[PDB]
């Protein structure tokens, strides 16, 4: 009983005889990309227009269809798919006959459970399985906060949060990746949602009585002791009202911050294998297992998150559990998952909560870059950001007046510390008019002048705009009358945090007609004043902070695309797309910039960067941003950033004996050391991510507010800011590469060392472009760190010039002032003169630094940095090629030309071969000078 085959112009459609999947479509999307759609029905038309994919089936791509016996082969020059005519399972081999991806079954459809809203008759819970018993490494998937780089063998929840961004693009150690084209909440690994502690474990209290012992304290005093199965204070139901309230006795201690708690008991897993544990919390929490600490975390009360770890447990054993949670007003819940079936332990699994079909894209590629490029091809080119966006950004939550912004920008300039951009956060409008986009006349009397003064200092300014509107405002009213307001937040009477609290709602971005009004409102009221960029905050959305995720789903129902759940991950894309499109409409020659706090497949097509949101000034959090950036980049989204120093510091840092802590001078003596060391190490890390940006709540975050002029830490911070600008020719080349070469800036070691398994798992190093191996110091008071030098390359210590071999893990010198940096032998690194902002360095003189010991290649990308002319071919490359055997650097014929490009360039070349005291002394280094005119010239390396 074999399937009928229909030969389409884009591939095949198999009609399966039995099983829940009735039809299976293969679509050739490009030379290396095949779409796979398993349908429990006969009408592919029931499947929604992609929010992620803008790419249509290819017309110019040759492909063959061969059929014989029980298999049906569909192949291109680069990819072949082998489908069984028996069950419908697809098998992908490369162009040279190797199994890259095998489907197990044909999928598992089942009822939609996690949707609070009435479900479409033809919607289902999706799940596809692949490659059982694989040794594969897995990467990408987006920005996550649990330290994973290689996801193999573990779970990821691809939900949407303040701190989390799902990009369902999975990259393999092998030569392929896939795009899971579902807009709802999706899960990698375990299909299930982590249940309460008590669902797959038996609980024993303090004595051993078969739930946990929950002691309640007010300060140090013991006030109650009962036992509960599921200790749960995870969510608000309504406004500031917990879902489960605190006992009569201490209901008061919660509000005043004296309440503290302890859990005590024992857990006995009932199955043998690897268990997952998740501690969802605010305030101070420490989980202890077996008389030893496993987790120690803290977060601001209003932005909790999950903190995870995996243990190997035996079915009969009992282990001792102790927790200590000082809620300081926040939330708590412990979750857990028990080991999956035996055959599913080592396999690839993807499942969504609602959809009409299993829909994904197989993407083949000989290198990881090639695979990102297939992602870029499906979801849209990552459009050029303006050049200034890769400069330093100074933000605060918040500058309170036109005066303050201009004062802080002037301080940088006065101190000759480089800076391109300053940011105006929320609350510049009249308090009772969020959504009006007006400027409070008390603090911001002349916005055009404010922008004008910023611009006169050769800087750019960005401004916050939410999707949030008060029903009192005209702008709300306009949107509401077209039916485009998400009004359930109003019925629920949810007040925000401003003053006595205001009623408020979020618009519905899933209609282009809706986003066109949105843009026209902000165009009419903000764009006319000439702001450079849009900080599109709160685009998860976070309509009301801390409600359940079902309630969050319920709140965006109805939207243009159906239920809240059917699109839980996709809000940021249609939204940013609307702003991008209006900008193009208004100024068809300038580059827009958007920073937005959430994404999904395709976000990069809106000229948007993302950041990880409200993280906390903690070391655990700085460490975790490494994997967060890595996974985002390997997901296909490179322009990424975070808050240097974290969004919210603990209270010890904000308030002191001297009152409100603005400058570090107002800190409690004992606190200064750590605040200065945290920011020093974080600024170091920050200068080596795609966007370099200081922001957060008090204390103030300008370099001169973190420490005094002349001190070690001030000097270390100024230095890396300066380095960032010295490196701008290198960096902005990455910048151009993101678009023209479908490039990726923040690189997981697997991209550049894919044959090195040890490198796969590393979660605290990475490649910053092709040359730099970045190794942030993430431990308070550490003055060295272990650093793995990947095999197959030699490495130079960037600062000293000492040359080490790879294949080893060194103990790298990491004094406070320096983050361990190593250059890959064979790198060609261009630097420019010291500049204070990107345009100053246009057409600048170059130092070309060649790190000998291997061949090298770097093409310097240059253009005007601001315009769209690059799209009509207005840009240039200056090709650099280095042969280690001849010791010769060829600076090739200049390719291209753009408006305002200099024909002549003063370029000087030097070669590092081992230790040199001038390793970073760019201005004074011995270098051979060249007057380059676009014509190829050669520079020999010095003798012996």
Closest residue to Cl ion, judged by C-beta, is 836
Residue closer to Ni ion by CB (options 455, 482) is 455
Shortest approach of Ni ion to residue 420 CB, angstroms? 10
- For 313, the enclosing helix (H) or strand (E) is strand 305-313
455 is a site residue for Ni ion (CB under 5 A): yes
Shortest approach of Cl ion to residue 835 CB, angstroms? 7
Shortest approach of Ni ion to residue 591 CB, angstroms? 14
458 is a site residue for Ni ion (CB under 5 A): yes
Residue closer to Cl ion by CB (options 598, 836) is 836
416 is a site residue for Ni ion (CB under 5 A): no
Shortest approach of Ni ion to residue 719 CB, angstroms? 20
Which entry of 117, 566, 614, 621 is annotated as an active-site residue?
Answer: 614
**Cα(695)–Cα(705) distance, integer angstroms:** 12
Burial annotation 190-211 (CB, 10 A radius, 16+ → b, else e): bbeebebbbebbebbbbeeeeb
Shortest approach of Ni ion to residue 386 CB, angstroms? 13
Residue closer to Cl ion by CB (options 840, 874) is 840
Shortest approach of Ni ion to residue 871 CB, angstroms? 23
844 is a site residue for Ni ion (CB under 5 A): no
Residue 524 known to be catalytic: no
Question: Interface with Ni ion by CB under 5 A: which range of 9-17, 451-459, 671-679, 851-859?
Answer: 451-459
Listed in order, strand segments (DSSP E) in 817-897 are 821-824, 828-831, 846-851, 856-862, 875-883, 888-891, 895-897
Residue closer to Cl ion by CB (options 403, 840) is 840
- The set of residues, in sequence order, having a beta carbon less than 8 Å from that of 304 and lying 6+ positions away, is 234, 280, 281, 282, 330, 331, 332, 546
Residue closer to Ni ion by CB (options 179, 417) is 417
Q: If you ran DSSP here, which 8-state letter would residue 111 be given?
A: -
Residue closer to Ni ion by CB (options 166, 394) is 394
Say if CB 116 and CB 553 are below 8 A apart: yes
Shortest approach of Ni ion to residue 582 CB, angstroms? 19
Shortest approach of Cl ion to residue 30 CB, angstroms? 45
Say if CB 793 and CB 824 are below 8 A apart: yes
Say if CB 222 and CB 214 are below 8 A apart: no
Number of neighbouring beta carbons within 10 Å of residue 516 = 15
3 state DSSP class of 40: coil
Question: Interface with Ni ion by CB under 5 A: which range of 256-264, 747-755, 837-845, 857-865?
Answer: 837-845
Listed in order, strand segments (DSSP E) in 671-820 are 692-694, 746-747, 766-768, 772-774, 784-789, 794-797, 803-805, 808-813
> Residue 550's binding partner, choosing from Ni ion, Cl ion, none, with beta-carbon cut-off 5 to 8 A by kind?
none
Which entry of 87, 103, 262, 537 is annotated as an active-site residue?
Answer: 537
Measure the CA dihedral 86/92/97/98, to 10°: -110
> Residue 559's binding partner, choosing from Ni ion, Cl ion, none, with beta-carbon cut-off 5 to 8 A by kind?
none
**Cα(918)–Cα(85) distance, integer angstroms:** 67
Closest residue to Ni ion, judged by C-beta, is 455
Residues that bind Cl ion (CB under 5 A): 458, 836, 840
> Residue 455's binding partner, choosing from Cl ion, Ni ion, none, with beta-carbon cut-off 5 to 8 A by kind?
Ni ion
Please report how the helices 447-456 and 402-414 are oriented relative to each other, as an axis angle in degrees rounded to 10. 0
Residue closer to Cl ion by CB (options 193, 840) is 840
3 state DSSP class of 595: strand
Residue 366 known to be catalytic: no
CA distance to 24, 104, 151, 230, 348, per residue, from 88 (Å): 7, 10, 28, 43, 18
Residue closer to Ni ion by CB (options 201, 463) is 463
590 is a site residue for Ni ion (CB under 5 A): no
**Cα(309)–Cα(322) distance, integer angstroms:** 15
> Residue 460's binding partner, choosing from Cl ion, Ni ion, none, with beta-carbon cut-off 5 to 8 A by kind?
none
Residue closer to Ni ion by CB (options 225, 458) is 458
Question: Interface with Ni ion by CB under 5 A: which range of 35-43, 449-457, 674-682, 730-738?
Answer: 449-457
CA distance to 183, 269, 370, 375, 490, per residue, from 178 (Å): 15, 35, 12, 8, 40
3 state DSSP class of 252: helix
Residue closer to Ni ion by CB (options 90, 406) is 406
> Residue 7's binding partner, choosing from Ni ion, Cl ion, none, with beta-carbon cut-off 5 to 8 A by kind?
none
Number of H helices, E strands in the chain: 17, 59
448 is a site residue for Ni ion (CB under 5 A): no
Shortest approach of Ni ion to residue 533 CB, angstroms? 13
Residues in the chain: 944
Shortest approach of Ni ion to residue 461 CB, angstroms? 10
840 is a site residue for Ni ion (CB under 5 A): yes
Residue closer to Ni ion by CB (options 458, 671) is 458
Percent helix / strand / coil, the chain, rounded to 5: 20, 30, 45
Shortest approach of Cl ion to residue 458 CB, angstroms? 4
Binding mask 725-764 for Ni ion (x = CB under 5 A): ----------------------------------------
Shortest approach of Cl ion to residue 713 CB, angstroms? 25
* Token reading at 664: 């570090």
Say if CB 286 and CB 296 are below 8 A apart: yes
> Residue 802's binding partner, choosing from Ni ion, Cl ion, none, with beta-carbon cut-off 5 to 8 A by kind?
none
Task: List binders of Ni ion among 466-505 (CB under 5 A).
Answer: none
Pairing of strands 293-299, 283-289: antiparallel
β-sheet bridge partners, residue 842: none
Listed in order, strand segments (DSSP E) in 544-603 are 594-596
State the number of binding residues for Ni ion (CB under 5 A): 3
CA distance to 83, 531, 831, per residue, from 474 (Å): 57, 22, 51
Sign of CA dihedral 353, 354, 359, 364: negative
Residue closer to Ni ion by CB (options 232, 458) is 458
Please report how the helices 712-726 and 669-686 are oriented relative to each other, as an axis angle in degrees rounded to 10. 10
Residue 87 known to be catalytic: no
**Cα(425)–Cα(502) distance, integer angstroms:** 19
Which entry of 540, 542, 650, 863 is annotated as an active-site residue?
Answer: 540
Lateral strand order in the sheet of 928-932: 828-831, 846-851, 905-912, 928-932
Shortest approach of Cl ion to residue 865 CB, angstroms? 14
> Residue 478's binding partner, choosing from Ni ion, Cl ion, none, with beta-carbon cut-off 5 to 8 A by kind?
none
Residue closer to Ni ion by CB (options 311, 529) is 529
- For 576, the enclosing helix (H) or strand (E) is helix 572-586
Question: Interface with Ni ion by CB under 5 A: which range of 18-26, 127-135, 453-461, 841-849?
Answer: 453-461
> Residue 373's binding partner, choosing from Cl ion, Ni ion, none, with beta-carbon cut-off 5 to 8 A by kind?
none
The string of DSSP letters for 881-906 reads: EEETTTTEEEEPPPEEE-TT--S-EE
CA nearest to 809, candidates 857, 852, 768, 759 = 759
Residues in contact with Ni ion by the rule CB under 5 A: 455, 458, 840
What positions carry a catalytic annotation?
A: 537, 540, 614
């Amino acid at each position: 009983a074999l399937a009928q085959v229909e030969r389409t112009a884009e591939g095949v459609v198999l009609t399966l005889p039995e099983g829940t999947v009735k039809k299976l479509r293969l679509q050739v999307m490009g030379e290396r990309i095949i779409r796979v759609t398993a349908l429990p029905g006969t009408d592919f038309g029931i499947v929604p227009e992609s929010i992620q994919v803008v790419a249509k089936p290819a017309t110019n791509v040759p492909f063959s269809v061969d059929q014989a016996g029980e298999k049906l082969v569909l192949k291109t020059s680069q990819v072949s798919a082998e489908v069984s005519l028996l069950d419908g399972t697809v098998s992908f081999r490369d162009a040279k006959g190797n199994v890259l991806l095998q489907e197990e079954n044909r999928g598992t459809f089942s009822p939609v459970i996690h949707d609070p809203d009435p479900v479409d008759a033809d919607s289902y819970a999706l799940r596809q399985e692949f490659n059982r018993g694989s040794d594969e490494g897995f990467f990408g998937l987006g920005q996550h906060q649990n330290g994973q780089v290689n996801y193999a063998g573990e779970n990821v929840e691809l939900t949407t949060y303040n701190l989390v961004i799902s990009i369902p693009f999975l990259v393999s150690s092998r030569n392929y990746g896939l795009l899971w084209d579902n807009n709802s909440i999706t899960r990698f690994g375990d299909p299930r949602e982590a249940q309460p502690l008590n669902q797959s474990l038996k609980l024993y209290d303090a004595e051993g009585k078969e739930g946990l012992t929950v002691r309640y304290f007010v300060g140090d005093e013991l006030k109650l002791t009962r036992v509960e199965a599921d200790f749960n204070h995870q969510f608000y139901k309504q406004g500031n009202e917990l879902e489960n309230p605190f006992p009569e006795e201490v209901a008061g201690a919660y509000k005043n911050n004296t309440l503290r708690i302890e859990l005590e008991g024992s857990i006995e897993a009932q199955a043998t294998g690897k268990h997952q544990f998740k501690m969802y919390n605010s305030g101070y929490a420490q989980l202890s297992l077996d008389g030893e600490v496993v987790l120690d975390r803290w977060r601001m009360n209003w932005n909790p998150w999950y903190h995870n770890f995996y243990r190997e447990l035996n079915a009969g054993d009992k282990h001792k559990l102790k927790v200590s949670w000082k809620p300081d007003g926040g939330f708590f819940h412990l979750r857990h998952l028990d080991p999956l079936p035996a055959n599913e332990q080592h396999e690839l699994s993807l499942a969504s909560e609602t959809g009409k079909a299993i829909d994904y894209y197989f993407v083949a590629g000989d290198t990881k870059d090639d695979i990102i490029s297939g992602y870029r091809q499906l979801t849209g080119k990552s459009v050029m950001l303006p050049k200034w966006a890769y400069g330093f950004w100074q933000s605060r939550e918040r500058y309170k007046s036109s005066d303050e912004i201009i004062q802080n920008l002037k301080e940088y300039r006065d101190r000759k510390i480089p800076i391109d951009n300053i940011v105006l956060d929320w609350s510049y409008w009249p308090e009772d008019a969020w959504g009006s986009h007006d400027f409070d006349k008390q603090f911001f009397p002349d916005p055009k002048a404010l922008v004008d003064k910023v611009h006169a200092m050769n800087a750019q300014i960005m401004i916050s705009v939410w999707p949030k509107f008060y029903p009192t405002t005209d702008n709300y009213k306009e949107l509401n009358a077209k039916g485009f307001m998400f009004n359930r937040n109003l019925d629920e009477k949810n007040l925000d945090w401003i003053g006595k609290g205001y009623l408020n709602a979020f618009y519905d971005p899933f209609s282009p007609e809706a986003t066109a009004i949105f843009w026209k409102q902000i165009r009419d009221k903000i764009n006319v004043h000439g702001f450079d960029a849009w900080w599109l905050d709160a685009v998860e959305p976070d309509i009301h902070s801390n409600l359940t995720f079902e309630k969050r789903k319920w709140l965006m129902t109805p939207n243009a695309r159906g239920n809240g759940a059917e699109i839980f991950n996709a809000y940021a894309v249609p939204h940013a797309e609307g702003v991008y499109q209006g900008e193009l409409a208004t100024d068809g020659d300038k580059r827009s910039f958007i920073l937005t706090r959430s994404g999904f497949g395709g976000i990069q097509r809106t000229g948007s960067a993302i950041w990880s949101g409200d993280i906390v000034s903690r070391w655990s959090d700085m460490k975790d941003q490494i994997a967060a950036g890595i996974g985002t980049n390997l997901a296909g989204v490179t322009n990424w950033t975070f808050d240097i120093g974290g969004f919210t510091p603990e209270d010890r840092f904000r308030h002191g004996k001297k009152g409100f802590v603005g400058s570090w001078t107002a800190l409690d003596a004992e606190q200064v050391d750590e605040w200065q060391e945290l920011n020093t190490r974080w600024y170091q890390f920050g200068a080596f991510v795609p966007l370099y940006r200081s922001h957060g709540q008090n204390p103030y975050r300008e370099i001169f507010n973190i420490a005094d002029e002349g001190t070690e830490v001030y000097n270390a911070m100024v230095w890396y800011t300066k380095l960032r600008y010295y490196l701008m020719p290198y960096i902005y080349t990455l910048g151009g590469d993101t678009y023209h070469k479908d490039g990726t800036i923040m690189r997981g070691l697997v991209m550049d060392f894919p044959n090195d398994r040890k490198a796969w798992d590393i979660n605290t190093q990475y490649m910053f472009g092709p040359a730099f191996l970045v190794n942030p110091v993430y431990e308070y008071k550490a003055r060295s760190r272990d650093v793995y030098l990947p095999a197959g390359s030699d490495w130079y210590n960037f600062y000293t010039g000492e040359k080490l071999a790879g294949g080893q893990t060194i103990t790298a010198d990491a004094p406070l002032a320096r983050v361990p940096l190593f250059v890959k032998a064979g790198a060609i690194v261009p630097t420019g003169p010291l500049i204070q902002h990107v345009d100053e360095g246009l057409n600048s003189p170059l130092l070309i630094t060649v790190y000998t010991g291997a061949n090298g290649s770097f093409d310097i990308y240059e253009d005007d940095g601001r315009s769209l002319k690059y799209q009509q071919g207005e840009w240039s490359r200056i090709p650099l090629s280095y042969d280690d055997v001849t010791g010769t650097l060829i600076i090739g014929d200049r390719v291209g030309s753009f408006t305002g490009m200099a024909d002549e360039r003063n370029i000087r070349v030097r070669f590092i071969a081992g230790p040199t005291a001038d390793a970073t002394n760019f201005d004074k280094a011995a270098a051979e000078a060249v007057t380059y005119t676009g014509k190829s010239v050669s520079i020999k390396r010095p003798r012996k």
